[PDB]
Amino acid sequence: APLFAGTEHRAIMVDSMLHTVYRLSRGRSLTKAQRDVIEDCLMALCRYIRPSMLQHLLRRLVFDVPILNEFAKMPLKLLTNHYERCWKYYCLPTGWANFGVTSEEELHLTRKLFWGIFDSLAHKKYDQELYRIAMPCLCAIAGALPPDYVDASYSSKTEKNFDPRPVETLNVIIPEKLDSFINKFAEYTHEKWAFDKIQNNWSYGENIDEELKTHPMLRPYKTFSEKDKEIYRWPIKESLKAMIAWEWTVEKAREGEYNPQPPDLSVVTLSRELQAMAEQLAENYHNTWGRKKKQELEAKGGGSHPLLVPYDTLTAKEKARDREKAQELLKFLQMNGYAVTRGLKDMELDTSSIEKRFAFGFLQQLLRWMDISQEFIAHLEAVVSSGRVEKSPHEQEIKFFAKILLPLINQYFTNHCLYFLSTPAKVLGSGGHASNKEKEMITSLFCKLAALVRHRVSLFGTDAPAVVNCLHILARSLDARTVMKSGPEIVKAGLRSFFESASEDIEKMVENLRLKGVGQNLTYTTVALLPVLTTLFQHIAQHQFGDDVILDDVQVSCYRTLCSIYSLGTTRNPYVEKLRPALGECLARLAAAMPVAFLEPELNEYNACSVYTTKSPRERAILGLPNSVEEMCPDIPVLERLMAEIGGLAESGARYTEMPHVIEITLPMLCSYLPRWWERGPEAPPPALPAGAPPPCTAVTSDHLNSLLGNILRIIVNNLGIDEASWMKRLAVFAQPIVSRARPELLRSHFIPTIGRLRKRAGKVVAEEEQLRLEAKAEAEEGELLVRDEFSVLCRDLYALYPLLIRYVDNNRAHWLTEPNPNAEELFRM
């Protein structure tokens, strides 16, 4: 098989081989081992043949696989591997290196394959093996399809062994006006064929033998024989009768207008409706032609027609042949005055390229299934409340939603995250950006999934992790800025309701924690809400969506969430002890994302994002908003008080047991609050300062960050050597971002003493190790574990402090090298 790479020259023979092997695989009277061998051969061949050469096999699979019978198991795996290997060939605009780029026909076949498989699986009953084989195939096809691919042959009708059965042209009647056009177009087509004969250098003669280069039937229409005139007319009769049978009404507004004298047809250009006319008319030509070759297949007792595949499946180059003649007929109707009307089902959709994008339809289907999921979840809740009814009328829907949609969403919105986040101004991804409608649809999907899982984690059971992961992915793919700026009130209210419900659930969890609904809220908030809320806040902060998303009602909800998480700091329950890390991470992300300096209410007047500025005093009384941002909630100390408390504790030398809340909640929140407001307060790069702006709404300077970093280092130093301290790594990770603003004085003030202490401890432990070598057996065996534990705690302390030092070194190594520093040299020695 590896030798088949680079066989573009023998493309016909390679295609024939692939078709033959596929037919053999679909063979009766074959043993299991034989079938396995054939399938292995097919997979090996497709693993090395260039993606461009597998187009005909893809065409056959597009017709065979959607059935999802027992013979579709191997085609599904073949397609999975093919698309997983050649996804670039289809997705990237440039294509795959040295292989080229996909064609419109290949992309159309891929989309048809995806949707056929999706529909068949949705309508099929649950089958573990079938679902396990089909989900990867759907994921691969979706990942290969470009998100914004628009199907040129998009057919809202999407009508339909193959059915070559055409319409009943012969039984349907033919108007006399259409018969007049039939005669005139028979004359025209004879003149066209005479012109073609002129191109071929074929004159009038006694026979059409090639060597004579003549045509026995080349004379004017008048002398044209009635038999041959009828022969020319008969195809025209059948075409027009097909049009009548379709209920296509033809109106003759005007009248129709040897040496060939065929009037030019290039003068008239087919409209979109006339192009669809010709599309279906040529499709019927192909269907009649198919009925014929079916007749010779029946006569032969076997065989299959190579071009039996429908027109849409057929490559455009093959279409072009009958394309020319069909469009000729329609155009001649037009300039003969015959305008044919159908009432196209795609006219209502006109062009709507955005609605024709693949991602648009995918999201539409996902939202419809979100509604279906709401229905069956409500039914499940009702039955588990009253009446032990196990019929499960939506069991198939449940299995589909949990086994196909969730993994499909997980992979698709993981792969195409950049497409949904890019905007016309900034193109984050390779090429193409999601439309506002697509962004709104993905936001609606996220909100609907969150509402579905709300207080219903147990209902999903083992699929709850999948739901939570999908929520994470959607939140990281959410374009909240654009959705909130220019979006429907429905989707905006959906996002606002998500935030409001999150705040309410957090409040209930906090009050319960400080002391079946209790269990429901606790498990839900711990498993789904807090992780998802943290992810959403982190995404907003990273993409700078805070100033555009967290306003008005969202700002109030975030205020409540923050002011409750912080209020959860005056208790000591074991439950609080276990849940503190997650609350601290959530609060840190919220502080990063918040557009209002909630620790500096005194300067809130200079903030254009604060609700007290966005909403007039007449508003904010319609709601329950206090009179002042200070009273928003007064349980969070101001920045000065918090810094003073942290510094006092650090100097006092307290331990984590004495400061559980400050180390796990307050400090992580400050490590995100200070960096955000340093960029918007005094001492920040003023490129926009010349533009008329008010004084900064914050007083954060590099001094604040330096003091916080020093305090964190002092706290870690104070807690050095403790047997158990897992908070050290979290604190170091949270403090890493604020190290870029550390002052040069920090080296000598904090780092040198800390690393000196660590070096002294390491020396002591190594001395104990050497004395252990001096010891013997029982003396050696014991004490070995003691020095092991000492080294373990030393390694914990080092992995807590060194990452902070590395960032500090990177930001000062240039200065140290430019100007030699004895303190830097001492640090090197340590």
């Binding site: 190594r813 240039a814 090298l817 430019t818």
Partner: protein
């Protein structure tokens, strides 16, 4: 050099023209079309 000391000097890298008595001669891609013999291995054009 403005950043050699910060990165490269201690790593042991040497300036490209450190001990050259004359500036290094340079060539540029001049966009003036010129007639040249058809390459014997040209991927598209062959002369017999």
């Amino acid at each position: 050099l403005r950043f050699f000391a910060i990165c490269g000097l201690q790593e042991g890298f040497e300036p490209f023209a450190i001990n050259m008595q004359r500036p290094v001669t340079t060539w540029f891609s001049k966009s003036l079309p010129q007639f040249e013999p058809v390459p014997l291995e040209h991927p598209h054009y062959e002369v017999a």
